[PDB]
Amino acid sequence: NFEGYVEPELFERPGTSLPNKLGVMPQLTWPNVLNGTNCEKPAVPNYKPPSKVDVIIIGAGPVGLTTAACLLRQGITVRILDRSPHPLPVGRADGLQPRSMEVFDLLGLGEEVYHVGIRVEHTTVYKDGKQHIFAESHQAPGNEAHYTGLHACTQTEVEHLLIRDLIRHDILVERPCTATSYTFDEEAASVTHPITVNITNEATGAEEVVTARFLVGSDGAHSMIRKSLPIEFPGVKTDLHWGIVDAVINSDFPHRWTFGTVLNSEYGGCLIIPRERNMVRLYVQLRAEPAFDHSKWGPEEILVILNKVFAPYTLSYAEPVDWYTILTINERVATSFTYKDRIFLAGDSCHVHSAKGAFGMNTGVMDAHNLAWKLAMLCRGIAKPSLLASYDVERRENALRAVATSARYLVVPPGEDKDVFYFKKFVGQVGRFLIGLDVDYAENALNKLSPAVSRARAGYRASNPRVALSRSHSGRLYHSFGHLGQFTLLVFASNMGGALNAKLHALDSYLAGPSSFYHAYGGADTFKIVVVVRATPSQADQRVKTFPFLSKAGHTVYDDQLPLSHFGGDAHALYGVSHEEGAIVVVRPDSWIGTSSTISDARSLESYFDGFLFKSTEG
Amino acid sequence: NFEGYVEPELFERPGTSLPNKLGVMPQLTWPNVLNGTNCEKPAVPNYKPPSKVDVIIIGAGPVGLTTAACLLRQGITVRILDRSPHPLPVGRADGLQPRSMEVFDLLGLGEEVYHVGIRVEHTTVYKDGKQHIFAESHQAPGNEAHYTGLHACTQTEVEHLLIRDLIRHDILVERPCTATSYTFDEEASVTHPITVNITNEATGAEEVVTARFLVGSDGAHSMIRKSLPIEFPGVKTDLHWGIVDAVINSDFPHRWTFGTVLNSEYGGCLIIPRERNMVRLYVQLRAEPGKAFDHSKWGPEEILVILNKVFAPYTLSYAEPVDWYTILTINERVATSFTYKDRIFLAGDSCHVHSAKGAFGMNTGVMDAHNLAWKLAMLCRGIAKPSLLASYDVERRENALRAVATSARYLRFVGNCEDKDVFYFKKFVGQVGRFLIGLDVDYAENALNKLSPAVSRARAGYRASNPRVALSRSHSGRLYHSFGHLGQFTLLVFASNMGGALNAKLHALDSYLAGPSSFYHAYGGADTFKIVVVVRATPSQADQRVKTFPFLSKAGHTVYDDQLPLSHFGGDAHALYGVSHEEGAIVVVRPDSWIGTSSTISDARSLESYFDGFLFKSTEG
Ligand SMILES: Cc1cc2nc3c(=O)[nH]c(=O)nc-3n(C[C@H](O)[C@H](O)[C@H](O)COP(=O)(O)OP(=O)(O)OC[C@H]3O[C@@H](n4cnc5c(N)ncnc54)[C@H](O)[C@@H]3O)c2cc1C
Ligand SMILES: Cc1cc2nc3c(=O)[nH]c(=O)nc-3n(C[C@H](O)[C@H](O)[C@H](O)COP(=O)(O)OP(=O)(O)OC[C@H]3O[C@@H](n4cnc5c(N)ncnc54)[C@H](O)[C@@H]3O)c2cc1C
């Protein structure tokens, strides 16, 4: 006894971008599926969110939505709202770095961001009509990374998939609902919910107050929550300007379309970004003088200056403009990202960078990811103040790093071009940071450097080599990690023979005891044991069975890859583990290395966990 | 009470390919890990292979190894031999099509073939120094397919990853062992009517093995094919390709992008990008007038002079010693039959040989092996009627006959030679460019493929669509992820939102299937089928309704068809398979992921005679 299915109602939203001589593209959308509460038949039926919530989220852009989704995966009750009546129809951010892709894949959303748009794996450089560079680029090593290159997947499409994931968890974005004010009882231990937020529905007029444990401010560049705190938002209004267009553009450019840069020392530079559906996005330098004037800079105006930059190649529109705008470059970074461990900024509320870098969605999503697993452990009370302090530190300084490299985006060998040689050297110094594999967290309570392995480094990306999860399934070591509420204890065990056998038996006895760090901080509620055995699956299952605690609570994985070279790379060599001493690597929930230890030193982790965690016991 | 871990002995095997002025690269290997029984201590300790196995495999090239790997998933007992003392050090095939990627992914080996080498997603075409074409190519659409483009993954890497997968299953390739002779008692009923006579050519020890079935993956000069009254026709063009893998420097504006460089005077060149900054260049070499072709005349250095004539005015020069070099003579042949009395089966180059240029050999070979192995497994289980191994023969032979035809069309212009050369290539790409990436592997009707109008798009004998779906509230993946294992058909029960008209029909089907005489139970139950209920609703809405059908929730697996409506921002499984929300559908998906048939929810009885067309009745447990 259920109603039949009805196909969702298409609406072709018109385009708000300035047109060209062909028009502005409309944008396909489905308001009932995508507009949250602001619709006639909501994708979640009879959605009745509570008045008391663990986390309230102001802002339902890419960063708020990611935060919503990571929390919902940990069982944290959540409400989220956004002032706009519908998600972004087109434009703004347009692609993801390899490391952003890794994040979605760890959340179970890898298929939604992969193979949406095109893939960028090459770069070109031209100067004054003459090709200088065409090369493979944006690469990650296959024996350490699944994803490589940049991936076109726009902000619209990211909002779509994240809204659909919230729906799958029976959560809707409340639109179009503004958070007008909020209170924080800084003074009151007895209280659980010292936050109240007044919400006003700009469609219907109804007000509301929610009480919440924690508040996440992800409301963009002009954040009211940031403005309400003793936080400053310093930066430099460069007053340099980009004209940006997204469209299908016919050209005789030999490399249509390839990521890269077209330099004219005469007329300034152009940046090419290939797009889905035979489109290209073109950034172009914009300078005006006889004060910067927005009035005479339309889509057709910049195509005229574009043809001057690509001489002798010429560009002509083949269809109506998909997107278009002028951007002012202002880079800003909040002095702090936390406040009293109750109000938390993430995304454009914390930092604003030039669009050119493409950091906002990428750095934003990685902010939400860093925040959400720490904030979630705060909701079940095992998080010491240090843990959420590491959020502010780790992501603020990464925001500062993004600011330095965007500034310098802008001594030569004799037979060499001055502006192209500083490009190859730029690509060399920051290339891996531009793809996310070199996001670098300095030492803190969570990142404890250790010489126990020669290569895996605290505060740095965990390496993702190929391993066998079973006899039949040969995938990636990331696939064995725990969920967002657990730390992954990588226990490298060699082939569990030689010297290490005794040490592993010791290790087994330490861990089973109720005073072990595993048991001391919650057992399987906060840890996932992975035993990495460099042996055949039959030799390993045999041997793992002699270790009663390891067999009974560990998940064995088979490190059966060929030795490190251009034909292989096992986890032991790629993490830098000694076959005599073993290792216990602590991978944080977000995939970054936390610390490491030898099998003998497994007791050193009691101190390491005490730095940011309170003791806990499994359920 | 276990010995400590010893790191594998590395050996740099010298190259046997002719050098350039800088030499010939050695090739990294690890004899104790990769050479099977023929090493000092094997990677499977005390491999004691039985003298009586279900299936014995002759040849451990990509095809034989793939066949072993599929059978070992199924619990078939297997012995696999190869005359050669080690696997391929370098060269021959260098890449996989998107559809071969899907085949590895279904076997659980997708991560071993992805991100091994480079990826080809673009084509260029030059003629007489002027560029004519530079575009995205080899695309598959993302709302239907995970992989797209060409993936560089060599025969060497493929053999590596398949040998390692056999080690995980405690199987070693028996090297360097030759099947000298074999007997097949057609007289008698015995379980094991095949005996194979084996000589190790290292130690001279002979041995006899008894098998239920024999697989001839022994290559182009298959001894097994010759023993059988099976013909191997085709034409030997004595057209010649010069092939060279090397790091090559060039001022070519597109170095290196897949494509073709034409020169009117000097013929043509095919480009293939490779890992580690190499490139593969095919170039035509033509025999002088009257005289036969003289291999003696063409080394790496000579080939490079022809390449610089073909690429004028851009020049090429070696930066490193040659990684690989050979002269292939194109000779395309197909066996008149691929099976023999459903006891000896051919797969790979023993069945068909192609122009390397087309890169058919390894991709079709893996797909043959895939096709063969699941049918052969049901034959070992007993449930296979002869009609099914018949479908192996005609599916793969016909596909081989198709593959020959498209390169016969390609190779006429290239040997011969608004621009009419580039025009014929654009049309050629538009016509076969998706069979060339494998999505148009197209099986004609037979017992296994019955066309059915119950759905608008899914089609018997064609590739099952792979749209995005949610497998849980937090895991949004692909529909292939729900499919059964290699000895199961996937019963894709499209159920709409389980509401309206269909609620009644689906309640009937629930009680139909639960009976011991429904097609599900009659042909094996969970031993032959997996049910997937594809609900176009939200997860908790779907979970609730599914609870109201007791057999479907008891025995089916719910996936959530929650993408946006089919467009450029989405595509639900219901729309991409062509299901009507009034009728529903039971799309039957074969083990290899080709569509078998479909019916409406009310026509569930129609599948009964479908499965009797090629299966014996079975009972779970
Ligand atoms: C015009 C423009 C162009 C851009 N171009 C690029 C680009 O080319 N490349 C790139 O990488 N990045 C670009 N960005 C940045 C990118 O859009 C953001 O970095 C990314 O969306 C992350 O921002 P966010 O999710 O934190 O918030 P945003 O998406 O900026 O906005 C957060 C949301 O909060 C809501 N909100 C604000 N105040 C309230 C309130 N009081 N109550 C309720 N809801 C509220 C807003 O409605 C908004 O939807 C651009 C941004 C803008 C504005
Ligand atoms: C020179 C050359 C170049 C090629 N180039 C390309 C290319 O560019 N692209 C492409 O896609 N394909 C190419 N191929 C084809 C590719 O090598 C084959 O398609 C692929 O190996 C599949 O063949 P197969 O596994 O069936 O047999 P193969 O790998 O060719 O050989 C089968 C195996 O059987 C073994 N064997 C033979 N007889 C016996 C016996 N009596 N007892 C035991 N073992 C035996 C052999 O030693 C060998 O290991 C090339 C092949 C060759 C020979």
Numbering used by the authors:
A (entry chain A): 6 to 193, 195 to 296, 299 to 418, 443 to 651
B (entry chain B): 6 to 193, 196 to 424, 448 to 651
How do the authors describe this structure?
In the crystal structure, each asymmetric unit contains four VibO molecules, which form two symmetric dimers, in line with our analytical ultracentrifugation-based assay. In the dimeric VibO structure, each VibO monomer contains 25 β-strands (β1-β25) and 13 α-helices (α1-α13), and is composed of three distinct sub-domains: the FAD-binding domain (residues 1–127, 141–245 and 336–419), the middle domain (residues 128–140, 246–335 and 420–472), and the C-terminal domain (residues 473–653). The C-terminal domain of VibO adopts a peroxiredoxin-like α/β-fold, which directly packs against the FAD-binding domain and is far away from the middle domain. In particular, the dimerization of VibO is mediated by three different types of sub-domain/sub-domain interactions between the two monomeric VibO molecules (the middle domain/middle domain interaction, the FAD-binding domain/FAD-binding domain interaction and the FAD-binding domain/C-terminal domain interaction), covering a total of ~3436 Å2 surface area. Across the middle and FAD-binding domains of VibO, the co-factor FAD is buried in a solvent-exposed and highly positive-charged pocket. Specifically, the ADP and ribityl groups of the bound FAD are embedded within the FAD-binding domain, whereas its isoalloxazine ring is located at the interface between the middle domain and the FAD-binding domain. Notably, the co-factor FAD in the crystal structure of the VibO/FAD complex adopts an “out”-conformation, suggesting that the bound FAD is located outside of the active site of VibO. Further careful analyses of the VibO structure uncovered that hydrogen bonds and electrostatic interactions are primarily responsible for the specific binding of VibO with FAD, involving the main chains of G66, V68, S89, D356, A363 and M369 as well as the side chains of R88, R97, Q160, R287 and D356 of VibO. Careful structural analyses showed that there is a highly hydrophobic cavity adjacent to the isoalloxazine ring of the bound FAD in the VibO/FAD complex, and importantly, this pocket corresponds to the substrate-binding site of the phenol hydroxylase PHHY.
